């Protein structure tokens, strides 16, 4: 969104993660590690599914032939019937299209905010061993390889292993 473009968050994503929709990345002389966060993805999926149920519970009246009509006799009345049917279908269609458009807008705009929450979860398990860059990034005093990153993705990361100040639980 506009947020990612302004704040300096990475333009474009990594194709390394087929595991989920959003995740974390490691840099260094150890190469480039990539991992995914399942709770973020699951939450997104729920937003969407609930959204769909909301769209699917819309109910509208039937539009059948009127009963005193008579094709031979009253055509003019009948033409007007046709008119009211067509007009209905049109209007209701527009309304629906709107509901969808709004819904999609929400789904897509929310994706920067997801990242912005992931930021806060990552900050949680560090200690002040890293500085907030504001880029959505931190600089850790140690090095982090793939196995090290999967443990942060799982939320099991607490470093006394790399011995640095711990945020107590």
């Amino acid at each position: 969104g506009f947020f990612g473009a302004i704040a300096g968050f990475l333009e474009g994503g990594w194709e390394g993660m087929i595991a989920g929709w959003h995740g974390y990345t490691s840099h260094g002389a150890h190469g480039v590690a990539v991992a995914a966060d399942l709770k973020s993805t699951q939450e997104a999926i729920n937003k969407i599914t609930k959204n769909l149920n909301s769209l699917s519970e819309l109910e509208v009246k039937n539009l059948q032939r009127l009963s005193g009509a008579m094709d031979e006799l009253h055509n003019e009345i009948l033409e007007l019937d046709e008119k009211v049917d067509d007009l209905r279908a049109d209007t209701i269609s527009s309304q629906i299209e709107l509901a969808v458009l709004l819904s999609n807008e929400g789904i897509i705009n929310s994706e920067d905010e997801h990242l912005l929450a992931l930021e806060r979860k990552l900050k949680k398990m560090l200690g002040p061993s890293a500085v907030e860059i504001g880029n959505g990034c931190f600089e850790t005093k140690h090095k982090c390889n793939q196995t090290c990153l999967d443990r942060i993705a799982a939320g099991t990361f607490d470093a006394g292993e790399f011995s640095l100040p711990t945020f107590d639980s």
Binding site: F9, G13, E15, I18, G23, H27, M70, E72, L115, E139
Partner: protein, 341 residues
């Protein structure tokens, strides 16, 4: 070492609409749309579905049942939904009618509109005692009854004036048609008249010249005048050649209100009479009704509800239905397309 946040990159063929970002390519989508396929008609799930006025009146059309043609009589059951199969309905026999000279053809489709229909009991008027002198009641082959032999429509009596006696031409006689039905029922009265050979006319009634007729029921007035010489070739009739023909009309009588008919020689005075109430939601279908469906679409016949909305030909549809939409719509299930880096 630096640790950052990122989102995925993958194949993003699906496109979606968004007010702020314009039209974007996206990882995945949940389609909300379907273009259904034309199938035969069926029985609406939760509900009665009326095709044929009375089934079990075999070798009878709905017009036949409506006109009260001998041997077509039966329970006309009730429905909250009816299907209109005959746009220009037909008779399957009895006496030759000149259909097209009145609105009579639609009578079945009219009855169809209601939830509850029923022929009456007794008679809305005594034909033999009617104004214009005592009448013998006429019957004709081509109208056989439970037995066999000469009969007529239940719906009306063919007033032939007795025998030589006072048989002659009269000025219009006027007649009231009593209400006869119950409560909040509409009462549909069927009536008409009969003409013949110039010589046959003078044999039957006292008169060669044409006769004239009038119906008035709650605001709706109609006027008719007879043909003497050669008529159209007989059609939709019972099959026996006759020199004469018959004109048939119905007149609806509101809830409670009476009705009027004026006539000269050859009148068919109404006898049994339609009694209708409730309303059925009618669609344009074509039998037979096969199986069950959630939905009945005028274009697509039977339908089952799959996705909330559909794209395609729109028309009248009843039942649990998907909603019609201008364009196939997609809900976004995924992320914005991100080029790899």
């Amino acid at each position: 070492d630096r640790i950052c946040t990122g989102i995925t990159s993958s194949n993003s063929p699906h496109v979606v609409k968004t007010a702020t970002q314009g039209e974007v390519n996206v990882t995945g989508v949940i389609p909300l749309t379907t273009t259904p396929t034309k199938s035969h008609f069926a029985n609406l799930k939760g509900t009665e579905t009326r095709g044929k006025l009375c089934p079990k009146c075999l070798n009878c059309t709905d017009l036949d049942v409506a006109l009260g043609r001998p041997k077509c009589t039966g329970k006309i059951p009730s429905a909250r939904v009816s299907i209109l199969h005959e746009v220009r309905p037909v008779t399957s026999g009895c006496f030759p009618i000149m259909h097209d000279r009145t609105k009579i053809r639609q009578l079945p489709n009219l009855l169809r509109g209601y939830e509850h229909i029923r022929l009456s009991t007794h008679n809305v008027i005594n034909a033999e005692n009617a104004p214009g002198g005592p009448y013998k009641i006429g019957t004709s082959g081509s109208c056989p009854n439970i037995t066999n032999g000469n009969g007529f429509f239940a719906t009306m009596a063919w007033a032939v004036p007795k025998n030589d006696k006072n048989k002659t031409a009269t000025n219009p006689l006027t007649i009231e048609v009593p209400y006869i039905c119950t409560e909040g029922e509409d009462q549909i009265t069927v009536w008409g008249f009969h003409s013949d050979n110039e010589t046959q006319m003078a044999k039957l009634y006292g008169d060669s010249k044409p006769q004239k007729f009038t119906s008035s029921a709650n605001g709706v007035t109609t006027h008719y005048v007879s043909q003497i010489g050669g008529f159209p070739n007989q059609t939709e009739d019972g099959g026996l050649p006759q020199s004469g023909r018959i004109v048939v009309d119905y007149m609806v009588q509101k809830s409670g209100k009476t009705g009027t008919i004026t006539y000269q020689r050859g009148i068919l005075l109404p006898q049994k009479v339609w009694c209708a109430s409730g309303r059925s939601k009618v669609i344009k279908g074509s039998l037979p009704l096969i199986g069950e469906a959630d939905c009945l679409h005028e274009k697509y016949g039977g339908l089952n509800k799959s996705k909330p909305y559909y794209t395609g030909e729109h028309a009248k549809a009843i039942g649990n239905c998907p909603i019609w939409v201008k364009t196939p719509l997609k809900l976004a299930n995924g992320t914005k397309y991100r080029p790899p880096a």
